[PDB]
Design a protein around this motif. Structure first.
Motif, PDB file in Angstrom:
ATOM      1  N   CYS A   1      -3.549  10.036  -1.706  1.00  0.00           N
ATOM      2  CA  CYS A   1      -4.460   8.992  -1.244  1.00  0.00           C
ATOM      3  C   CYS A   1      -5.203   8.319  -2.395  1.00  0.00           C
ATOM      4  CB  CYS A   1      -5.464   9.570  -0.244  1.00  0.00           C
ATOM      5  SG  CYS A   1      -6.199  11.143  -0.753  1.00  0.00           S
TER       6      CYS A   1
ATOM      7  N   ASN B   1      -3.214   5.669  -4.087  1.00  0.00           N
ATOM      8  CA  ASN B   1      -3.295   4.446  -3.306  1.00  0.00           C
ATOM      9  C   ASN B   1      -4.543   3.656  -3.683  1.00  0.00           C
ATOM     10  OD1 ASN B   1      -2.756   2.588  -0.937  1.00  0.00           O
ATOM     11  ND2 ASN B   1      -4.673   3.531  -0.244  1.00  0.00           N
TER      12      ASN B   1
ATOM     13  N   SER C   1       0.833  -1.197   0.000  1.00  0.00           N
ATOM     14  CA  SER C   1       0.000   0.000   0.000  1.00  0.00           C
ATOM     15  C   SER C   1       0.872   1.253   0.000  1.00  0.00           C
ATOM     16  CB  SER C   1      -0.939   0.008   1.207  1.00  0.00           C
ATOM     17  OG  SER C   1      -1.731   1.182   1.221  1.00  0.00           O
ATOM     18  N   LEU C   2       0.339   2.345  -0.538  1.00  0.00           N
ATOM     19  CA  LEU C   2       1.097   3.585  -0.675  1.00  0.00           C
ATOM     20  C   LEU C   2       0.917   4.497   0.536  1.00  0.00           C
ATOM     21  CD1 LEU C   2       2.831   5.188  -2.908  1.00  0.00           C
ATOM     22  CD2 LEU C   2       0.680   6.381  -3.393  1.00  0.00           C
TER      23      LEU C   2
ATOM     24  N   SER D   1      -4.039   4.344   3.454  1.00  0.00           N
ATOM     25  CA  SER D   1      -2.718   4.832   3.061  1.00  0.00           C
ATOM     26  C   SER D   1      -1.616   4.447   4.046  1.00  0.00           C
ATOM     27  CB  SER D   1      -2.746   6.352   2.892  1.00  0.00           C
ATOM     28  OG  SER D   1      -3.701   6.743   1.922  1.00  0.00           O
TER      29      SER D   1
END
Ligand SMILES: [Zn+2]
Length: 311
Positions: free
Chosen positions: A109, A112, A101-102, A283
């Motif tokens: 966001c 993501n 996940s980013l 995030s």
């Protein structure tokens, strides 16, 4: 004086002669060296022989090699894409139980949301070589090229917030299926006649307007251009996966339904969730829940194998 190597693809190089009187930008054009835009600097001797990535003032050759690597793009694309790469190298990826996940930064966001969705989509590939290469790099564990690229194609801006669903469209607009997919819509008007509208491949796996399988397989009703009672219904649907997406829709999600994932929009903020109970990814910060009140925007269902005799 100075001679350097100029490329736009990391494969084809031409030598350009430079003095140390004016700047790179004035002599040559927008040039990146090891990621850094140094167009407005003085050519130093320590920059000799090394390779530069040109961004504007391309030869007829380099221009052709650009259009084959990235597809048809506007004259500001390459600079924007190179710039974005430098901007986003600071970003980080969190890995919770082999799920990437980013981490949140600079209002990213929505990226993501896009990427965690795309990581679930099976049997997709991109026709544009540079994008497909970046995509294979992303699944390999290095996502800088990919993230930067879809921001470039999406005309995004670093820091600025953005519509995640708009982007997931632009990206998917450039992809295609490595398998079979069929979606047939059947309209009919008694004065006009029966008409079958067919979609194949990716376009059969993604619909905009409806959030669940139920409202999708439902009989629409309206007015034919003929001037009367017209109808519409999905009679055939065969996919490896299904991506439904509409405006933010508030509801309670319980966990046992048959979603596989979905995105949420809070407010300017996006969240991605999956069902392995409900697992959510805000995030980087992972959470588990059994029910959730949220404004769903995109939903992901497994493979469709459905037929309707239409009665
Ligand atoms: Zn009609």
């Amino acid at each position: 004086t100075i001679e350097v190597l100029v490329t736009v693809d990391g494969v084809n190089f031409r030598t350009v002669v430079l003095n140390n009187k004016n700047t790179y930008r004035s002599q040559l054009g927008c040039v990146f060296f090891n990621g850094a835009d140094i167009s407005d600097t003085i050519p130093d001797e320590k920059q000799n022989g090394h390779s530069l990535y040109l961004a504007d003032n391309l030869t007829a050759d380099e221009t052709k090699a650009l259009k084959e690597l990235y597809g048809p793009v506007d004259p500001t694309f390459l600079h924007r894409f190179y710039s974005l790469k430098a901007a986003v190298h600071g970003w980080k990826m969190v890995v919770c139980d082999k799920v990437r996940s980013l981490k949140l930064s600079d209002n990213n966001c929505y990226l993501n949301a896009v990427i965690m969705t795309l990581d679930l989509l099976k049997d997709i590939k991109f026709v544009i070589p540079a994008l497909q290469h970046a995509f294979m790099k992303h699944k390999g564990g290095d996502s800088t090229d990919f993230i930067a690229l879809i921001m470039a194609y999406g005309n995004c801006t670093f820091g600025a917030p953005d519509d995640a669903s708009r982007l997931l469209h632009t990206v998917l607009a450039k992809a295609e299926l490595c398998c079979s997919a069929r979606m047939v819509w059947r309209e009919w008007c008694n004065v006009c006649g029966i008409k079958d509208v067919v979609l194949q491949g990716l376009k059969a796996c993604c619909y905009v307007g409806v959030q669940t399988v139920e409202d999708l397989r439902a009989r629409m009703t309206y007015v034919c251009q003929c001037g009367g009672e017209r109808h519409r219904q999905l009679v055939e649907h065969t996919t490896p996966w299904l991506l439904l997406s509409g405006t933010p829709n508030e509801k309670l999600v319980t966990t046992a339904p048959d979603f596989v994932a979905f995105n949420v929009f809070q407010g300017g903020h996006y969240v991605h969730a999956r069902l392995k109970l409900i697992l959510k990814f805000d995030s980087g910060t992972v959470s588990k829940t059994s029910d959730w009140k949220c404004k769903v925007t995109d939903v992901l269902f497994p493979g469709q194998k459905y037929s309707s005799d239409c009665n």
